[PDB]
What does this fold into?
Amino acid sequence: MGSRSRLLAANAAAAAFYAQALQSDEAAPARQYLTERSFDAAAARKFGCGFAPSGWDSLTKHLQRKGFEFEELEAAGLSRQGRHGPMDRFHRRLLWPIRTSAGEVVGFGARRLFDDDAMEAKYVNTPETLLYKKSSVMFGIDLAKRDIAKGHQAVVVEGYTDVMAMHLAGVTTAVASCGTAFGGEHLAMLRRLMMDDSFFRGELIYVFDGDEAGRAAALKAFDGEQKLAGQSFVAVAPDGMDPCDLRLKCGDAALRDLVARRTPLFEFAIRAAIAEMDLDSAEGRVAALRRCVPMVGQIKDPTLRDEYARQLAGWVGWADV
Amino acid sequence: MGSRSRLLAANAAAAAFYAQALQSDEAAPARQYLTERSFDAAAARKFGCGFAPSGWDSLTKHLQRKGFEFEELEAAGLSRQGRHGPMDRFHRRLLWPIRTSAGEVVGFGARRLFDDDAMEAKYVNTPETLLYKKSSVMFGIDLAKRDIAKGHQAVVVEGYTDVMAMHLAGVTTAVASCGTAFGGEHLAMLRRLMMDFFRGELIYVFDGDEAGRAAALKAFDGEQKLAGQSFVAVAPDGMDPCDLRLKCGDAALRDLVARRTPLFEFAIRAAIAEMDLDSAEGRVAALRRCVPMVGQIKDPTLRDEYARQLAGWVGWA
DNA sequence: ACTCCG
DNA sequence: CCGGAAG
It folds into this structure.
């Protein structure tokens, strides 16, 4: 009673219930959200997509009949303390079940679909429980687990629909931060899977939406450098778009090649600084070096710093590229 | 009395005596030898180079005066009992001290300088003492210990003079298996240093000759998952790292190490080099001989990488 | 493997 | 009245 093995059965029973409810009459805008961005019902079923019904306690009552006591459901982040009996957490929202590496269901990410929705946020997730650890949790991990270790690659993307779009386009290494910013436990988790024989060898690709978001991620490459900055990479979609919207406009090939034709994390940052530079005659040419040999100076890896110093003169214009 | 700290004291005092002896009259061939390949006195002082004097027992007496019993000096591998009294191990030679990673002298490596030298062998070493362990001992480790950990790169030259050259040229990760060839306990030490950050390269540097390919047929056989992180640089023909610095310069050695071939790539393209490859009949025979090699690669992702490139290496098939 | 020159 | 290498 009220232990991991029980609570994972509740979330599994809930996943089934929410996946059942996706096919109802009132779940029309939920299915339309998916098909609007090229996600058919077979894709929705692969990622466990679901709908949260509109009533007070449509889930709580369903699980209470299946045998689950309320205190277990409260602990699993499905039901909650109400006035006239217990009530549900999620209402009138498109759901994505969030699984572990093992494929055990730990929580849900719920998207808004209605203007009269009482909940403010565009996305809301399961609260902190014994099962659901926001800071370590990642969407897509159950599917990607084997492909990231085999391939020695991981593609980090922003949202839920970005992970679906990547997986359907062949990029099965794709995962998402899921509720908050990408962080240390997420890296630690991903890094552990790519390890072989007590050595890390793979590559760590970060996809971004718009340009400044990625420039505002490359900046922080130099912040600590304890991470695998040498094995980190950046991919930015053509001016404006993100992986989901890129798939609609230009098809599954554009995603495969966005990942393929990427840039190293330090390179992207350095060249971003040269991009915003005058570079005509010697005036702005020296102003480039002035500003971004400090950037090279900050690189702690001497093998890697020597490589960027070699190429620095060429990129600004004073040497042959 | 014959303890570990006693034998360290004896060896350090011996390295001091031998270093003083290098500035003497009879040590002129040793001073020339070093300076003849661009190692000045400042370099010689950095690595602690020294001359073993000519007589029967100049060191042995010198240490006995300082306090050291003969029994300790025999355990330290410095002296040995002759019939008319104690006598030195080394005579009339250029010595390099060999140290622990901390910087403590455990033994000595000694080169022949004269045609009338007692010992005809090219290099003498200290025997298996309580400190000196041939299988784990490495010249240049004291100087590189830090830099291989920071840089995540270890460079394995052959000779004593190659370690010297590399370090003066800026390759401060260079190291050398003195006495014996490079081995298991050396790898296990260098692998350890580079862990404490995850990854780590490991570059081997041979002369421009068949020595590299023979030590290399041994690239496939064992599981050896450090073979992904192994690399092989090789200079212009005939030249060790010491000779390369004489001809070309300090920049040539840096770039030799920086322009390195991976161990599997080196092994494949070595077999490609000894093949017809001009006619279309020649390309097929090459492709036939060196897919078994790509098949011997146990790692599947690494195997497929080398298969892709194989079409290119064999003159576009 | 027991019996010439630094 | 040597120690290494000769064999």
